[PDB]
Design a protein around this ligand. Structure first.
Ligand SMILES: Nc1ncnc2c1ncn2[C@@H]1O[C@H](COP(=O)(O)OP(=O)(O)O)[C@@H](O)[C@H]1O
Ligand SMILES: Nc1ncnc2c1ncn2[C@@H]1O[C@H](COP(=O)(O)OP(=O)(O)O)[C@@H](O)[C@H]1O
Ligand SMILES: Nc1ncnc2c1ncn2[C@@H]1O[C@H](COP(=O)(O)OP(=O)(O)O)[C@@H](O)[C@H]1O
Ligand SMILES: Nc1ncnc2c1ncn2[C@@H]1O[C@H](COP(=O)(O)OP(=O)(O)O)[C@@H](O)[C@H]1O
Ligand SMILES: Nc1ncnc2c1ncn2[C@@H]1O[C@H](COP(=O)(O)OP(=O)(O)O)[C@@H](O)[C@H]1O
Ligand SMILES: Nc1ncnc2c1ncn2[C@@H]1O[C@H](COP(=O)(O)OP(=O)(O)O)[C@@H](O)[C@H]1O
Ligand SMILES: CCSc1ccccc1NC(=O)C[C@@H](C)N1Cc2ccccc2C1=O
Ligand SMILES: CCSc1ccccc1NC(=O)C[C@@H](C)N1Cc2ccccc2C1=O
Ligand SMILES: CCSc1ccccc1NC(=O)C[C@@H](C)N1Cc2ccccc2C1=O
Ligand SMILES: CCSc1ccccc1NC(=O)C[C@@H](C)N1Cc2ccccc2C1=O
Ligand SMILES: CCSc1ccccc1NC(=O)C[C@@H](C)N1Cc2ccccc2C1=O
Ligand SMILES: CCSc1ccccc1NC(=O)C[C@@H](C)N1Cc2ccccc2C1=O
Lengths: 289, 289, 289, 289, 289, 289
């Protein structure tokens, strides 16, 4: 059944994304800490956020990190659960999920892969409205701002999402999670090697330089392959008999199996989407007399 | 469950739309106040209306304002509820809604996003008749004019709505809610700032001049962004420690993130629809001997 | 529930259509009055009729007028009732309707908008047979001619109607209800003003001359708009305070909002249908030696 | 419910079709009368027949006449009943129909409009097998030849009919019912006037000459129109007051409204089908030494 | 209900197909008679077969003949039974059929028209797997080779049958049942005339010569037509009154109504299929040193 | 019901595929034997594998061999069972299968023909997600790494499987099972002849040389055909009466009926798939300073 706890991952685990960290802090921490200011200015705190970007870039990690920092319970609803709700034609369970989230406030309700249903039906003879997202947004409208329940959605295909969600009262802001850069990749590599002992001759900077287009999942996979090679070598040596830490050789061997999950076309499309939004922004020249 | 009350908004809240205000008054207030004249002329009061226009222009606000002025209960039926009835194949709940509206007369029954079902199926292998609008118009026909129940519909896509609703006995009139003009935008900005204190140096007229194509929702969003910026600045200042009213700088900053929800093509299409209806009117030359 | 009564309308209410009046009389009155002649000649009385023509021309009025003249109960089955029988997949209620009609003989069963189901499915992957018309014609075949139950159908789209109905045993004839002419328009205007007092200076002939392509519903709407304008003016004058009959000014104002419901293309198509039937008639030259 | 009785019609009622009369006699009469010959030759009597031709030519009349001649019960299953069984998804009732036919042997089971289901599906995404014809042919296979139950099918579209029925064990032969010829038309007109007294000056031969392409239904309709005109004239004369047999004038008037149900293209297609079968026959030259 | 017995037909009834007779003997007789050899060589006996060819060539007859020769029960399953199991969505009855076959071992289970479901779907939006053939495969895999249950399938369209059936463990071999040749046609005619007495003057060889492309069903139909003509002539002679064996003249007359069930294109396609398989065989040159 | 046992087949039974054997050993045997190393390095053992290649190359044999070597229970789920779960809309039985696998750890769960559902729907109006694979991967995510349950999947069409399975947490690695080479073919032939006695003069090398493109199933079929020919010859000799080991003649005869299941186009496509993955690998040059 559902698991409700305080995620262990902290801010240090996530490398880079300083602006997104600051913005998420502003959105989540401030309303609970200082409601007096919001009352004074009569502004209604934002209800939720929507992360969109290429897969394996740090969305679920960001949600867990903010939940841990706020010290609030975290409820995760993966895509297969949504698809099970759709196929079984039993959409009445969303009410139960929302009630469970309400019971354990403060909380952050994370709807992973919010686009799964849209993809499953083509990405489709019908329109853009399905029988699960309808219930989700109905319950979202029906909730009370008195409770500190924060809804976060994550997708890697922000062009088939039902537009009704992005209305001002349900999920206003859109945050873009880009591919890591050189400094970001160095930070990612540093973060992931805190658990696996590594020889000191390894140069993380050089490794980060050579992997230009890479998602975080790819760097994690590289680390796992290096660890697996080391384990295999150690076990073979133990088997040798009569008849401990990763070195550079294992990383060199592992890099041959590295691959780029996201093709250049997908990144180009994502930057096109971001540029479209930033162009629709407009109003670069403005000032009172 | 459903909420039945007297909406709080009033006429002074809504900016502009003087002609629509007068026409709605004529449609709603007059029948109840002076039934003697209608009896003398033997006229049957109009049963409902249908607002059509681009999203975020002030339809729900107009319905609430007229309900408040008439001092009558207001029942809102949003689009997600209609879609829930369609998906669940349980269209027999419309009878319950109409019974509830009848029980609390005088009342105005507001059907928001009356075209949602049509969009959900493409906008579609079948025809223009669905299984929910059928029940709605059946109940509408089966009602008694003795009661003071007024049906108001809204929609931002008045070209896929089922033509059967627009028959003389169900929803005769069609009102057009255009985008605000310069004076309308100034009034809108004045109305929305009655809650958030603002520095006197702000020039609302200049701000309204520079936003040519804008819906009311966009101006509200601009105000909200300015308020959020002010709250963030105050929070940062308080956090600074040792180691109250919005100014012009916050509006200048917020304007950079402003956006136009409705594209030019949509406004062109709506103007084309209005001009098509007006051309269909015709008969500009008429005078008895 | 259903309403079974004697319609209050009368032949005078309907303007024009003298030929159709005479033919409907010949079809309905003669069978009941003088069954002896039919027995002598061994001819079976015709069972039903099918009106077809542009909307708002006087079909329901014709049915009600004939029912009133025969002094027989009138049962109306609107289009939405058929559509809800189709959507709910409960077509067994047609037996109940026919039994109710049989119980209260003599009666005329009026199936309004008999083509609604065909339109609802496109006008369509399948063929021309649905699950409601099937039951209707089964019951129609299964009834006894000794009873005086008369089935009258109406439709404004006599090209998607299932051909099985038009077989000799079910619905023999096809009457055409054309748009009113100048004399017909004058009569229509005279009929509708029997209840609204009107100043003597109004010239109905001139008004009828200037409305070339119109339907009865449009003329009724013109009258309603004039009455609404008069009521508004009277109420405003009463409101003036310190601080009864229609005139030509009100009609002049109302005519600006007049419109033609049916486009020229539809009239052309209907005329082509009628001419196709009259060409299929043929046999102009014929005489025995 | 179902009606099981001996049809009243006789051979004299049907005009023409001598060859088909002889064939039907040879098919049904001989098996029951002289089973000894069939036993001696060890031949299995043919089980059923299939009538195919343009509508309204005398298929049901042929079935009724042969049933009356054999003095056997006649069970009729119209098209609407088959369509009702298809729509309701309850095809298990065919077993009951066949059992009822068995209980009343000798009998002829007449499946009117055997192609209705195929037409209702388009004439269609699926194949040529439906859920009712399957049960019909299953029961046909499961019947005992000892009983004298004769299955006769009719249809006016012998190209969408499921080919499985025409296999040797189910429905062997395919009789063709053509449009009446001049002598056939004269006989048809003579047959239908046995009930309506007619002035002796009427020349049936001349009337039949001038109707080149006509079906029996059209001639019956002409007679009915003449009778209706005479009835109307007599009713008017009786109404005259102070203030018996059809003459030629009534036929002259009725001829104006005559029509041809079957177009030339349909007759061309039917003749094409018959000639295709005849060409497939072949083997015109054959003789032993 | 189902019938389980030992078919009466024997080898001498079927004409020609000597090679197929020998191969079926090798497939069926040898496993039961001499299991010792199979145990010694450690080879698993083949489980089933699949006949494919144009309709009416002697597939069912071959199955019945092998069943009779082996003196084992024969369970037949026609296409309509499979189709009704598909339409009713009750595929769980296949388990009962297989259990019944197991109960009466040794037996041969004959699935007639194994492609009926595929044809009924078009020959189709979906793939090549249906809901009944799946159950057949499951039961076939779940069977025990200890029992002597032999599965034989037939089909006259071996290009839409689900490819999963032809896997090594389910139905390995395929046999082609060609159209009879001249000698085969002579044998077929001889076999079918063992019942109807025939005058010695008839020359079967000449009749077989003149029918180049015919199927067995056509020859049976020719014999039946000749017998029917003889019966009709005898009946007429007996009816004549005052006021035994088929001759050549009856065959001469019956030949006129003979027809070819299978068109040349179908035989060309079947020959193409056989040639494709034989080309895929290959390996005509092979020998060890 | 399901059968759970230790498969009999061993490594010796399978010919060739040395690299695949070593990799499967590394994946399965190592985690259970030396968990201390994995704990020390903090690496999480891989959960499953996914074989892909042309049919009949030895995927099931590899799974059974690894299960036997690890001495762990083996549970097989064939394609027909998955299709049965899909058609019946009863996908809740996957929980039962996974529970059964958990109960008997250590075990290897083998989902044979994992793509069957995708093929059955075209390979399709909808997307890439079905109602059974969803439950499978949900349960796979919900499993505990503490138990030694190893999910192995097989599929001979790795271009339509749902991409969600190939995510890092569900089924990480993809292994290619290519067509046997000359040495592999010789080994395959040697393995399959351990049960059927064969004359010493047979030259397996020469036989393997002449079959360039052949799957293992084809070689097994050749052996089976040779055995069948030998059995038939022995049976005939025994039948001869008055009135033991396979030789080269039987193989020479059997070669005539040999065939190639996989066309060259399929091998080309599979090679292109492998080359695409190996190109996506990239990173041929890498070395720290
Ligand atoms: N910024 C990051 N810092 C460290 N690890 C990261 C980062 N982004 C992604 N990862 C790696 O990716 C994995 C989680 O991916 P996730 O963010 O859930 O993908 P998605 O956003 O598609 O859900 C973790 O195992 C983590 O190691
Ligand atoms: N004429 C107006 N005056 C003031 N505010 C307006 C006006 N029109 C729209 N708004 C703003 O729009 C919001 C309501 O939008 P609404 O009218 O419900 O959109 P829609 O018409 O699409 O339902 C309010 O928060 C309000 O601030
Ligand atoms: N011949 C007519 N005379 C008077 N009024 C008419 C006539 N035809 C239509 N009307 C007007 O039309 C209305 C009824 O229309 P109806 O005949 O029901 O349209 P439809 O035939 O499409 O159902 C009435 O209110 C009536 O005033
Ligand atoms: N050969 C005929 N002789 C007399 N009347 C005929 C003949 N053929 C058709 N009719 C007329 O047609 C009507 C019945 O038509 P029917 O045979 O049922 O058409 P269908 O064969 O399409 O069912 C009868 O009223 C009958 O008067
Ligand atoms: N080789 C044959 N010898 C004798 N009769 C045959 C032969 N082939 C077909 N027939 C005739 O065909 C009929 C059976 O046809 P069948 O083989 O069942 O067709 P299908 O193969 O389509 O099932 C029998 O009545 C039989 O007289
Ligand atoms: N490497 C191999 N060595 C020996 N036999 C093999 C080999 N590969 C396939 N086979 C043969 O193929 C059959 C099993 O095929 P299988 O591996 O189940 O095909 P698939 O992988 O399509 O399921 C066995 O009977 C076996 O004799
Ligand atoms: C926002 C990135 S969308 C995307 C991302 C990864 C993988 C696939 C997709 N979608 C597509 O490829 C469909 C095609 C038609 N795109 C292209 C595109 C560029 C900019 C804007 C909108 C669209 C759109 O609808
Ligand atoms: C009445 C505005 S309709 C509209 C408005 C916003 C967003 C979308 C839409 N519809 C469409 O874009 C579909 C296309 C085909 N339009 C265009 C159009 C102009 C005038 C009249 C009728 C139509 C119509 O059916
Ligand atoms: C009998 C008028 S039918 C009609 C009337 C109003 C509004 C629409 C329609 N139908 C159509 O427009 C569809 C088009 C394809 N028409 C045209 C037409 C002329 C004559 C005969 C038959 C057809 C037909 O099927
Ligand atoms: C046996 C005539 S069936 C028919 C009868 C009346 C009205 C319509 C129809 N069918 C059609 O018009 C469909 C078209 C495609 N036809 C024409 C045709 C001629 C000869 C052979 C077969 C076909 C066939 O399938
Ligand atoms: C094996 C004979 S299949 C057949 C037999 C009778 C009646 C109809 C059919 N099928 C078809 O006509 C469909 C068309 C597309 N054919 C032709 C063909 C020749 C060779 C190989 C395969 C195919 C195939 O799929
Ligand atoms: C991975 C080979 S999949 C395959 C194997 C055997 C038999 C058939 C198939 N699929 C197909 O033939 C469909 C066609 C459209 N292919 C070709 C192809 C080559 C490489 C990559 C992807 C594709 C793809 O989608």
């Amino acid at each position: 059944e559902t698991v409700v706890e305080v995620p262990q991952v902290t801010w240090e685990d996530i490398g880079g994304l300083e602006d997104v960290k600051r913005e998420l802090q502003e959105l989540v921490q401030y309303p609970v800490e200082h409601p007096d200011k919001f009352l004074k200015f009569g502004m209604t705190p934002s209800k939720g956020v929507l992360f969109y970007g290429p897969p394996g870039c740090g969305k679920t990690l960001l949600a867990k990190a903010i939940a841990n920092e706020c010290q609030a319970n975290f409820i995760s609803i993966k895509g297969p659960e949504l698809l099970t709700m759709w196929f079984g034609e039993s959409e009445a369970n969303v009410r139960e999920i929302f009630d469970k989230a309400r019971q354990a406030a403060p909380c952050v309700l994370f709807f992973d892969e919010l686009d799964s249903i849209a993809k499953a039906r083509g990405g489709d003879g019908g329109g853009a409205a399905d029988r699960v997202i309808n219930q989700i947004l109905t319950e979202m409208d029906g909730m009370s701002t008195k409770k500190n329940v924060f809804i976060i959605g994550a997708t890697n295909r922000p062009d088939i999402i039902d537009p009704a969600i992005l209305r001002p009262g349900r999920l206003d802001q859109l945050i873009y999670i880009p591919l890591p850069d050189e400094k970001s990749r160095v930070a990612i590599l540093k973060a992931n090697l805190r658990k696996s002992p590594v020889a000191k001759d390894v140069d993380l900077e050089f490794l980060a330089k050579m992997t230009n287009g890479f998602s975080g999942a790819d760097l994690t996979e590289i680390c796992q392959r290096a660890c697996k090679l080391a384990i295999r070598e150690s076990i073979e040596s133990e088997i040798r008999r009569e008849r401990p830490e990763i070195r550079r050789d294992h990383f060199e061997e592992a890099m041959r199996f590295a691959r780029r999950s996201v093709s250049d076309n997908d990144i180009r499309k994502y930057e096109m989407f971001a540029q479209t939004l930033q162009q629709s922004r407009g109003f670069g020249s403005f000032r009172f007399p």
